[PDB]
């Protein structure tokens, strides 16, 4: 079965065959679409088939399908599973696997960069202190003094589900949030619950508006432990506007390294519960969501006031106006400090090229439109006009339940 | 079986059961989501008629009454004898209002119960259609104080006697392919604009020429008609600060009226059912003006604002976009023509959703269409999970007549 995808802005029509290799479910049925829904221990039995599918794809990618090396590897893995219930990936398979989980992440608009990923093998790690060291090395390497490099650090895979490695932080770097007794919130409202956990665990919170949270690392299923990332390793950018000299006085700044650390990486059926990864920001993530979401820093009004916009009636579009300036400032500040960042026009244009390339060479590119289209100026970016097909391919990055909800404290 | 929908801005969670009454397919499957795709017999008829009548009588608190049963059998007999049936005026009105109520791609459904229905089922010719349409336009426009309305022409019979409004919207501007290779007017209507010429129309070769109606009655060939200029309310676009804006020579009509869809009620199909409401600012300022394939005016507005268009990161397109949209709303509001901004419209939809969930068990909604083309995440609907599914009565897309018409 072939599926056609059309771009209503250029009439370009693409054909998708890749979806035929989709196995996981989407959440949607032939009677309902859950496309806008945020989020809708294995056995030897279901493991080998998963390993085989992966290994077949791997050996096919290197043009060695059917080879003796390919057949031996399958027998080697099969024997290992029956012998230990699991199996270890070769370094080459790990790299291939991580890159493809990124390549398959339908909610990621920066996938044109997928083949450029530094993979740090932390599978020999055993303690939280070990995790800390690995993570600091990941941060310094990725930051690279502002010239960001994509990377991922992969810790030991899940075994019996009682010895999981987990990074309790949702992102390696994020600002603390504090609920005040008057009901207001200091810092990032999104991290209030995590911040409380850190404090309870022993963290001495400076209680500021931009306090870098400590790492809470869990190794081999043990109780998590706190660690402070060396300040000198956390690159930050003071936010100022190119024309509005008062912008700087808003006291705003943001970290330069976006690194998701709460997702699960699945390769050949194996589950890597601790796999922090990072790239570089698209301006709107900070300027639109982190700064202007009502449930985040929510700075629209203040910026609106300083600009002396007509805030009496929404139809003046004062929010829209302040939004553009804030995002202009974020981009400007980052480029000035020479910290990698990409605007939504560039990122979306590139994704389109990446997408078309993928249809031709791979037969498709699973993409989640709801997440791909930027949170501002939607239709003036090429992706808005691009029909997309969303389906799940493995290897992949998956969501997993927050650790504080499932962990058995020792 | 009881799906939940969460708003990530307010943590409010709503439970949806209405979807359990869905009957039509969505285009998606457990293995693939096509949520972003633009277009994913007597024996067949009665069950449909039955489904409708049941919900109708249920709505009037007469479910399982004699009146209910009586009507059910009368239609039943009528179908068996005539191979179809006619809706009572009450059913027709109820059906039209609910088709709007079920339109998952419409953000303005909070207004659903306030719909003026014009029963044009007694129509028989193209001139009769022109007359009915002019009356609709005049009623809906109401001197700038817009009123939602729909005019329903004769239902389908044997497919060879279908009524159709060839235009996509009752009021749109023409588009012509110039020698330059460029396009004059609205690029989206180039093809239609030609079928008018090819049919007789005398195009003024302008940038904003109100197109002529191409009405098709009882299956016969379509005919042209010029909408009385005095009935087509337009708004000149001027910025409330950029006096130079006017020099762009931009204007837009005040009455948005989709005319190429098919209304489905109890199995019956109304192929010609033009309907109208009032604009949400972004429709004109973002899509009609700034879409690269439309009037694509971003660069022009950018230049006159003296913005650094060298690098995309200066966000000039974004800045210009906002002004262009501030102007649209400004002009309409100045000329006292009904219009709603994306902020107010979206806030209303959220309220409507909550009403629908607590009073009906849900509200089908297509997030991809509901979220405005600009400033997405600063509107409440961005953070609102939505379940999309098809309920009848409904408004469906249908093949352009010029690809099905046997002259
Ligand atoms: C090189 C620069 C990169 C850019 C510009 C890019 C951009 C983005 C953006 C804008 C999002 C949406 C974030 C949000 O709204 O929460 C995203 C999501 C995603 N990206 Fe990328 N990305 C990059 C690198 C990476 C890397 C290196 C990986 C994996 C190795 C990756 C995996 C993903 C995943 C899995 C998601 C969804 C996360 C979630 O569900 O919360 N991205 N990316
Ligand atoms: C009262 C003011 C109304 C508002 C503010 C509203 C707004 C909108 C908007 C913004 C769209 C998207 C248009 C597009 O992007 O092409 C839309 C679509 C739609 N609306 Fe409404 N609407 C209104 C009245 C109506 C009425 C009277 C009906 C039905 C009788 C209706 C039925 C629909 C349908 C079926 C669609 C999707 C059409 C398509 O697929 O092209 N709307 N509405
Ligand atoms: C409800 C809706 O799915 C939700 O608000 C989504 C929409 N699109 C998004 N897109 C991106 N990139 N990131 C997000 O967090 C979201 N949130
Ligand atoms: C490809 C994609 O479905 C398409 O561009 C959609 C997106 N959302 C939309 N939303 C509205 N209201 N109107 C449209 O025409 C579209 N176009
Ligand atoms: C997914 C994450 C590591 N990258 C970003 N959030 N921005 O690019
Ligand atoms: C669908 C149409 C009749 N309404 C609008 N496009 N705007 O409200
Ligand atoms: Zn779907």
The CATH number for B351's domain is 3.90.340.10
- Cβ-Cβ contacts under 8 Å, A13 against chain B: none
What are the residues whose beta carbons fall under 8 Å from the beta carbon of A59, sequence distance 6 or more? A65, A66, A67, A69, A70, A73
Distance set, CA B390 to CA A267, B103, B132 (Å): 37, 8, 30
CB B273 within 8 A of CB B151: yes
CB B205 within 8 A of CB B217: no
Locus of tokens 């590897």: A73
The answer to whether residue B113 sits within a structural domain is: yes
* Burial of B91 (C-beta count, 10 Å sphere; 0-12/13-18/19+): buried
CA A372 to chain centre: 13
Q: Do A37 and B387 touch (CB under 8 A)?
A: yes
CA A120 to chain centre: 16
Q: Are residues A46 and A155 in the same domain?
A: yes
Looking at chain B, the residues that come just before a C–N gap of over 2.5 A are 40
List helix spans (H) across A144-254: 192-200
CB B35 within 8 A of CB A370: yes
> Quick one: which atom of ligand 4 is closest to the CA of B370?
12
Query: CA B402 to CA A270: how far, in whole Å?
Result: 56
Residue A285 known to be catalytic: yes
In the set A73, A93, A102, A111, the catalytic residue is A111
Q: Do B35 and A37 touch (CB under 8 A)?
A: no
DSSP E strand stretches across B323-407 = 394-396
Q: Are residues A52 and A156 in the same domain?
A: yes
Looking at chain A, the residues that come just before a C–N gap of over 2.5 A are 40
Query: CA B204 to CA B194: how far, in whole Å?
Result: 13
Which of B210, B168, B147, B132 lies closest to B337, judged by CA? Answer: B147
Q: Are residues B60 and B183 in the same domain?
A: no
Is B168 annotated to bind a ligand? Reply is no
Query: CA B73 to CA B71: how far, in whole Å?
Result: 5
Query: CA B154 to CA B262: how far, in whole Å?
Result: 12
Distance set, CA A206 to CA A211, A212, A217, A253 (Å): 7, 10, 20, 17
CA A163 to chain centre: 24
Distance A371 CA to ligand 3 centre (A): 5
Q: Which of B31, B34, B322 is nearest residue A317 as measured by Cβ atoms?
A: B322
Which of B339, B338, B261, B279 lies closest to B96, judged by CA? Answer: B261
CB A4 within 8 A of CB A14: yes
- Enter the tokens of residue A256: 């330069």
- Atom 11 of ligand 1, residue of closest alpha carbon: A108
CA-nearest residue of chain B to A23? B31
- Cβ-Cβ contacts under 8 Å, A331 against chain B: 313, 315
Query: CA B121 to CA B327: how far, in whole Å?
Result: 41
- Atom 5 of ligand 5, residue of closest alpha carbon: A258
Tell me how many degrees the CA angle B2-B4-B8 measures, rounded to the nearest 5. 180
Residue B283 known to be catalytic: yes
Distance set, CA A322 to CA A291, A300, B375 (Å): 11, 6, 11
Query: CA B348 to CA A273: how far, in whole Å?
Result: 42
Which of A84, A74, A24 lies closest to A49, judged by CA? Answer: A74
- Enter the tokens of residue A233: 């390793």
CA-nearest residue of chain A to B31? A25
Which of B241, B238, B242 lies closest to B331, judged by CA? Answer: B238
Query: CA A232 to CA A257: how far, in whole Å?
Result: 13
Query: CA B189 to CA B173: how far, in whole Å?
Result: 7
> Quick one: which atom of ligand 5 is closest to the CA of A280?
8
List helix spans (H) across A62-107: 68-84, 91-104
Nearest ligand to the CA of B258 is 6
What are the residues whose beta carbons fall under 8 Å from the beta carbon of A109, sequence distance 6 or more? A282, A347, A348, A351, A371, A372, A383
Q: Do A317 and B321 touch (CB under 8 A)?
A: no
Residue B109 known to be catalytic: yes
Tell me how many degrees the CA angle B7-B10-B16 measures, rounded to the nearest 5. 35
* Burial of A91 (C-beta count, 10 Å sphere; 0-12/13-18/19+): exposed
What are the residues whose beta carbons fall under 8 Å from the beta carbon of B74, sequence distance 6 or more? none
CB B176 within 8 A of CB B193: yes
Nearest ligand to the CA of B10 is 3
Q: Which DSSP string corresponds to A31-42?
A: TBB-TT-S----
- Cβ-Cβ contacts under 8 Å, A315 against chain B: 281, 329, 333, 341, 343-344
If DSSP codes are grouped into helix, strand and coil, which group holds residue A6? strand
Which of B10, B236, B399, B256 lies closest to A295, judged by CA? Answer: B10
What are the residues whose beta carbons fall under 8 Å from the beta carbon of A77, sequence distance 6 or more? A48, A51, A52, A55, A87
Q: Return the number of other C-beta atoms located less than 10 Å from residue B312's C-beta.
A: 17
Query: CA A315 to CA A309: how far, in whole Å?
Result: 12
Query: CA A389 to CA A92: how far, in whole Å?
Result: 30
Which of B349, B355, B289, B294 lies closest to B323, judged by CA? Answer: B289
The answer to whether residue A380 sits within a structural domain is: no
Which of B81, B274, B67, B239 lies closest to B165, judged by CA? Answer: B274
Query: CA A268 to CA A157: how far, in whole Å?
Result: 12
Q: Return the number of other C-beta atoms located less than 10 Å from residue B377's C-beta.
A: 21
> Quick one: which atom of ligand 4 is closest to the CA of B372?
12
Interface list for B 5-64 with A (CB within 8 A): 5-6, 8-9, 19, 22, 24-38
Is B106 annotated to bind a ligand? Reply is yes
Distance A53 CA to ligand 1 centre (A): 26
CB A188 within 8 A of CB A291: no
The answer to whether residue A11 sits within a structural domain is: no
Q: Are residues A89 and A143 in the same domain?
A: no
- Enter the tokens of residue A237: 């950018």
Q: Are residues A39 and A113 in the same domain?
A: yes
| b/e code A287-308 from CB counts within 10 Å (16+ = b) | bbbbbbbeebbebbeebbebbe
Q: Which DSSP string corresponds to B286-322?
A: IIIHH-TTTT--HHHHHHHTT---S-GGG-HHHHHHH
Which of B211, B209, B151 lies closest to B184, judged by CA? Answer: B209
CB B386 within 8 A of CB B367: yes
Provide the sign of the torsion angle of the four alpha carbons A50, A55, A60, A64, taken in this order.
negative
User: Which residues of A contribute to the annotated binding site?
Assistant: 36, 108, 171, 280-281, 285, 370-371, 384, 399
Q: Do B25 and A28 touch (CB under 8 A)?
A: no
The answer to whether residue A59 sits within a structural domain is: yes
Q: Are residues A293 and A309 in the same domain?
A: yes
Q: Which of A23, A323, A380 is nearest residue B378 as measured by Cβ atoms?
A: A323
Identify the CATH number of the domain in which residue A242 sits: 3.90.1230.10
Query: CA A371 to CA B385: how far, in whole Å?
Result: 13
What are the residues whose beta carbons fall under 8 Å from the beta carbon of B41, sequence distance 6 or more? none
The answer to whether residue A50 sits within a structural domain is: yes
CB A222 within 8 A of CB A128: yes
Resolution, angstroms, 1 dp: 2.0
Q: Which DSSP string corresponds to A100-128?
A: HHHHH-TT-TTGGGTT--EEEE-TT--SH
- Cβ-Cβ contacts under 8 Å, B5 against chain A: 37
Cα radius of gyration (chain A)? 23
CB B5 within 8 A of CB B14: yes
Q: Are residues B48 and B153 in the same domain?
A: yes
The values of phi and psi at residue B29, to 5°, are -145, 175
Q: Are residues A154 and A220 in the same domain?
A: no
As beta bridge partners, residue A277 has A152, A260
Q: Are residues A195 and A253 in the same domain?
A: no
Query: Regarding beta strands B116-119 and B149-152, do their DSSP bridges make them parallel or antiparallel, or are they unpaired?
Result: parallel
Which of B326, B367, B244 lies closest to B318, judged by CA? Answer: B326
A203: distance to nearest CA of chain B, Å? 28
Query: CA B152 to CA A48: how far, in whole Å?
Result: 61
**What does the H/E/C string look like for B136-149?**
HHHHHHHHHCCCCE
Q: Which of A9, A35, A314 is nearest residue B341 as measured by Cβ atoms?
A: A314
Is B283 annotated to bind a ligand? Reply is yes
Query: CA A214 to CA A197: how far, in whole Å?
Result: 11
CA B92 to chain centre: 19
DSSP E strand stretches across B201-296 = 213-216, 223-225, 234-236, 251-253, 257-258, 262-265, 268-270, 275-276
Q: Mutation target for B interface from A22, A320, A328, A363: give the one with most B CBs within 10 A.
A: A320
State whether the beta carbon of A351 lies less than 6 angstroms from ligand 1. no
Query: CA A234 to CA A34: how far, in whole Å?
Result: 38
* Burial of B27 (C-beta count, 10 Å sphere; 0-12/13-18/19+): middle
Furthest-apart CA atoms within chain B: distance in Å: 74
Distance set, CA A200 to CA A103, A209, A210, A225, A306 (Å): 38, 19, 19, 12, 38
Which of A124, A115, A122 lies closest to A136, judged by CA? Answer: A122
As beta bridge partners, residue B151 has B118
CB A317 within 8 A of CB B326: yes
Q: Are residues A337 and A254 in the same domain?
A: yes
- Cβ-Cβ contacts under 8 Å, A316 against chain B: 326
Tell me how many degrees the CA angle B179-B199-B254 measures, rounded to the nearest 5. 80
* Domain housing A110: 16-123+150-160+264-278+348-372
| DSSP summary character for residue A270 | E
Q: Do A380 and B298 touch (CB under 8 A)?
A: yes
- Atom 3 of ligand 4, residue of closest alpha carbon: B36
* Burial of B330 (C-beta count, 10 Å sphere; 0-12/13-18/19+): buried
Cα radius of gyration (chain B)? 23
Q: Do B389 and A328 touch (CB under 8 A)?
A: no
CB B360 within 8 A of CB B18: yes
Taking phi over 0 as left and psi of -120 to 50 as alpha, with beta for the rest, B73 belongs to alpha
State whether the beta carbon of A371 lies less than 6 angstroms from ligand 3. yes
> Which DSSP helix (H) or strand (E) runs through A153?
strand A151-154
Which of A150, A153, A157 lies closest to A134, judged by CA? Answer: A153
Identify the CATH number of the domain in which residue A218 sits: 3.90.440.10
What are the residues whose beta carbons fall under 8 Å from the beta carbon of B272, sequence distance 6 or more? B129, B153, B154, B162, B163, B164, B165, B216, B259
In the set B109, B164, B172, B238, the catalytic residue is B109
- Enter the tokens of residue A277: 């990864």
Distance B269 CA to ligand 4 centre (A): 26
Helix axis angle, A91-104 to A44-61, nearest 10°: 90
Domains identified in chain A, total number: 3
Q: Which DSSP string corresponds to A192-211?
A: HHHHHHHHHTT------SSP
Q: Which DSSP string corresponds to B84-123?
A: S----HHHHHHHHHHHHHT-TT-TTGGGTT--EEEE-TT-
Distance A379 CA to ligand 4 centre (A): 8
Query: CA B92 to CA B275: how far, in whole Å?
Result: 14
In the set B283, B290, B323, B356, the catalytic residue is B283
CA-nearest residue of chain A to B21? A31
As beta bridge partners, residue A341 has A281
* Burial of B294 (C-beta count, 10 Å sphere; 0-12/13-18/19+): middle
- Enter the tokens of residue A75: 């027998």
Query: CA A341 to CA A334: how far, in whole Å?
Result: 7
CB A215 within 8 A of CB A227: yes
What are the residues whose beta carbons fall under 8 Å from the beta carbon of B69, sequence distance 6 or more? none
Measured between its terminal Cα atoms, the distance across chain A in Å is: 52
The values of phi and psi at residue B370, to 5°, are -70, -40
The answer to whether residue A304 sits within a structural domain is: yes
What are the residues whose beta carbons fall under 8 Å from the beta carbon of B385, sequence distance 6 or more? A36, A37, A38, B5, B6, B7, B8, B367
CB B110 within 8 A of CB B348: yes
- Enter the tokens of residue B223: 């005919």
| DSSP summary character for residue A391 | -
CB B139 within 8 A of CB B149: yes
B342: distance to nearest CA of chain A, Å? 8
Q: Are residues B129 and B116 in the same domain?
A: no
Which of B230, B229, B246 lies closest to B238, judged by CA? Answer: B246
The answer to whether residue B406 sits within a structural domain is: no
Helix axis angle, B66-82 to B42-59, nearest 10°: 160
Is B244 annotated to bind a ligand? Reply is no
Query: CA B268 to CA B284: how far, in whole Å?
Result: 33
Which of A315, A327, A313 lies closest to B326, judged by CA? Answer: A315
Q: Are residues A79 and A141 in the same domain?
A: no
DSSP E strand stretches across A169-262 = 177-179, 185-187, 215-218, 225-227, 236-238, 253-255, 259-260
The answer to whether residue A330 sits within a structural domain is: yes
Q: Do A315 and B329 touch (CB under 8 A)?
A: yes
Distance A322 CA to ligand 7 centre (A): 34
Distance B380 CA to ligand 6 centre (A): 20
What are the residues whose beta carbons fall under 8 Å from the beta carbon of A308, sequence distance 6 or more? none
As beta bridge partners, residue A216 has A226
């Amino acid at each position: 079965r072939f599926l056609k995808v059309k771009n209503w802005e250029t009439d370009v029509v693409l054909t998708d065959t890749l979806h035929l290799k989709s196995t996981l479910e989407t959440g949607c049925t032939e009677h309902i679409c859950m496309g806008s829904i945020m989020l809708p221990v294995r056995t030897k039995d279901q493991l080998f088939p998963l390993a085989k599918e992966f290994l077949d794809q791997y050996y096919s990618s290197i043009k060695r399908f059917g080879s003796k090396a390919h057949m031996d590897r399958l027998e080697e893995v099969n024997k290992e599973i029956e012998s230990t219930s699991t199996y270890q990936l070769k370094d080459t398979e790990l790299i291939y696997g991580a890159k493809h989980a990124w390549r398959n992440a339908s909610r990621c608009v920066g996938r044109i960069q997928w083949s450029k990923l530094q993979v740090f093998d932390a599978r020999d790690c055993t303690t939280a202190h070990g995790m800390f060291n690995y993570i600091c090395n990941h941060v310094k390497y990725a930051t690279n003094k502002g010239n960001l490099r994509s990377a991922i650090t992969i810790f030991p895979q899940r075994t019996d589900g009682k010895h999981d490695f987990r990074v309790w932080n949702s992102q390696l770097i994020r600002y603390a949030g504090y609920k005040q007794p008057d009901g207001s919130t200091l810092g990032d409202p999104a991290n209030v619950q995590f911040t409380e956990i850190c404090i309870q665990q022993g963290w001495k919170a400076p209680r500021g508006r931009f306090d870098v949270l400590p790492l809470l690392l869990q190794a081999n299923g043990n109780d998590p432990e706190l660690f402070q990332i060396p300040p000198e390793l956390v690159l930050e950018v003071p936010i100022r506007h190119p024309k509005f000299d008062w912008f700087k006085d808003l006291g705003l700044k943001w970290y330069g390294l976006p690194a998701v650390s709460n997702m699960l990486l699945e390769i050949g059926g194996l589950e890597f519960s601790a796999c922090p990864f990072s790239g570089w920001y698209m301006g709107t993530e900070i300027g639109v969501r982190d700064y202007c979401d009502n449930s985040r820093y929510n700075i629209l009004e203040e910026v609106a006031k300083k600009m002396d916009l007509d805030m009496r009636k929404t139809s003046s579009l004062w929010k829209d106006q302040a939004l553009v300036e804030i995002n202009i400032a974020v981009l400007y500040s980052f480029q000035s400090d020479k910290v990698t960042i990409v605007d939504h026009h560039s990122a979306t244009e590139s994704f389109i090229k990446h997408m078309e390339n993928e249809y031709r060479c791979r037969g498709g590119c699973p993409a989640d439109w709801v997440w791909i289209v930027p949170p501002m100026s939607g239709s003036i970016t090429p992706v808005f006009h691009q029909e997309m097909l969303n389906y799940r391919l493995t290897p992949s990055f998956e969501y997993q339940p927050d650790p504080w909800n499932t962990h058995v404290w020792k």
